[PDB]
């Protein structure tokens, strides 16, 4: 039974109180104004952040909780989904012998809003929420989408960091996930996707993934709804590939099993932090030099205790970083225990690093009481 939303569904469990005034006075639900959205710059990328006090944030959150979480997705989408994780994206490819990796350029900016409307239409009943002026689907997309002030030409845009944007991206790209999965299956290729990074693997002894034909076919498919392939990040290798530090290897031939292991570049930062901890480097220097976390003087809440405040903050930040990396490798260990696909010697190295991390966190906590 698919999820259906009617007028009562929006008015009772979705809106609750965010748009009570609009529904009692029959006033049109307004666009997300620029006053509610702040524009952050990170790299060349631009992020859009909504203010929490606005009712749009709350209705986005309850939309995410109750509506977008029930629409079926494609199993090739491993990101932003309940139970999906990067290791799951990198696992089906342990069976492959040749690997290829593609990227979609500006995935979130290139999502057409009309495609979002078409994708969400079957799951929302066609009614008139506000008299005969605004339809229910129109109000919901008014809640979900946004108009970019920097680029007014392209009109309504699903922005980065709008709470509901990832789930909507998965839903609107389910069509292409199905198309590309069908094509790869007919070619005998294992396909998976994380956000916009696509990974293909051939378990047979063939050069299909290294050919220009495969790129051309994937691009031809992606042009159906207007996406493009980032040519700078295209990668194709044999018997071993490294994706953001996680190395998948398969030296075997017929019926062989590969292994996934993080490399030393990935563990460089944690190894350096443990080395600095063993060298009795002060905590402030460790936090600033490696963890790029610093206590700006404008962030200090009170002037009553400041010398103690800085030390406690840096102690807590080091504890939090060590615990975070401890849980990141525990995730690796759990994934290996569930699937048995991580390198055994790398499992030994993980165990050693985890014991070192635990001992260092114990030492820091013991020093906290001194």
């Amino acid at each position: 039974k698919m999820i259906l939303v009617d007028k009562v569904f929006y008015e009772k469990i979705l809106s609750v109180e965010s748009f009570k005034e609009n529904i009692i006075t029959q006033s049109a639900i307004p666009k997300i104004s620029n006053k509610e959205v702040r524009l952050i710059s990170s790299g060349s990328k631009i992020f859009y952040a909504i203010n929490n006090t606005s009712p749009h944030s709350h209705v986005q959150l309850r939309l995410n909780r109750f509506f977008l979480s029930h629409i079926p997705l494609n199993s090739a989408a491993k990101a932003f989904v309940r139970g999906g994780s990067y290791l799951k994206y990198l696992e089906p490819h342990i069976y492959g012998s040749s690997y290829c990796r593609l990227d979609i350029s500006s995935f979130f900016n290139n999502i057409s809003f009309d495609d979002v409307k078409q994708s969400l239409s079957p799951y929302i009943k066609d009614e008139y929420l506000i008299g005969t002026e605004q339809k229910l689907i129109d109000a919901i997309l008014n809640s979900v989408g946004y108009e970019s002030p920097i680029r007014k030409d392209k009109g309504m845009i699903i922005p980065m960091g709008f709470r509901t944007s990832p789930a909507i991206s998965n839903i609107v790209f389910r069509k292409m996930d199905l198309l590309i999965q069908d094509f790869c299956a007919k070619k005998g290729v294992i396909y998976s996707r994380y956000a916009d990074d696509m990974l293909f693997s051939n378990p047979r002894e063939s050069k299909l993934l290294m050919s220009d034909y495969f790129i051309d076919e994937i691009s031809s498919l992606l042009s159906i709804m207007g996406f493009n392939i980032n040519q700078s990040k295209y990668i194709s290798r044999e018997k071993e590939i490294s994706i953001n530090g996680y190395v998948i290897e398969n030296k075997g031939g017929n019926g062989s099993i590969g292994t996934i292991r993080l490399s030393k570049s990935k563990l460089n930062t944690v190894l350096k932090v443990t080395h600095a901890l063993a060298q009795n480097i002060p905590y402030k220097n460790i936090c600033n030099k490696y963890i790029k976390v610093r206590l700006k003087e404008k962030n200090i809440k009170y002037e009553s205790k400041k010398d103690e405040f800085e030390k406690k903050y840096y102690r807590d930040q080091l504890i939090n970083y060590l615990g975070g990396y401890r849980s990141y490798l525990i995730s690796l260990v759990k994934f290996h225990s569930e699937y048995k696909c991580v390198n055994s010697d790398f499992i030994i190295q993980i165990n050693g690093i985890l014991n070192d991390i635990q001992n260092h966190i114990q030492k820091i906590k013991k020093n906290r009481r001194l």
Binding site: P72, L73, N74, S75, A76, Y95, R174, L178, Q181, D182, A185, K186, G188, P203, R204, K251, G252, G253, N254, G255, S256, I257, E338, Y339, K340
Partner: protein, 150 residues
């Protein structure tokens, strides 16, 4: 051991289910209508397609996936010990060597082969059957002799 793992994706009542660490006796318990016999049907269809029988493909759990996969990881450590040895020169042993363990020890070099021989031997054979949306079936190993021998 015999079977290392069995994985079913999007077939019958299974979304992504992996069964591993098998023991000598495996008691399966569960409520009515939970898929206990669906494992039987999946294995039976996999083995029927292993011998190239003509049967109807199994139904997909959800139609929003274009594929349905069954993966079997056979444990061939003992068979490798059986056949690799120089004493067993029989014709069945020769067939098993020339079908399964040939073209797999071919790719390895002398150092890796000797490391596999001397250390604790652990060899697996992974076979994946993928059912497309148009009832076609594609294997990850394209040699039917391998499947019949398995």
């Amino acid at each position: 051991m015999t079977i290392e793992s069995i994985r079913v994706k999007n077939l019958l009542s299974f979304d992504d289910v992996i069964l591993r660490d098998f023991r000598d006796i495996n008691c399966i318990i569960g409520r009515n209508n939970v898929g206990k016999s669906n494992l039987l049907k999946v294995i039976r269809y996999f083995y029927a397609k292993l011998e190239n029988k003509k049967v109807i493909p199994l139904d997909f759990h959800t139609n929003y996936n274009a594929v349905g996969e069954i993966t079997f990881t056979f444990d061939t450590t003992r068979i490798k010990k059986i056949v690799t040895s120089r004493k067993n020169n029989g014709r069945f042993h020769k067939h098993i060597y020339n079908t399964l363990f040939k073209s797999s020890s071919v790719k390895l070099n002398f150092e890796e082969l000797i490391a596999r021989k001397n250390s604790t031997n652990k060899s697996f054979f992974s076979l994946t059957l993928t059912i497309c949306k148009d009832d076609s079936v594609m294997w990850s190993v394209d040699d039917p002799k391998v499947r019949s021998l398995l």
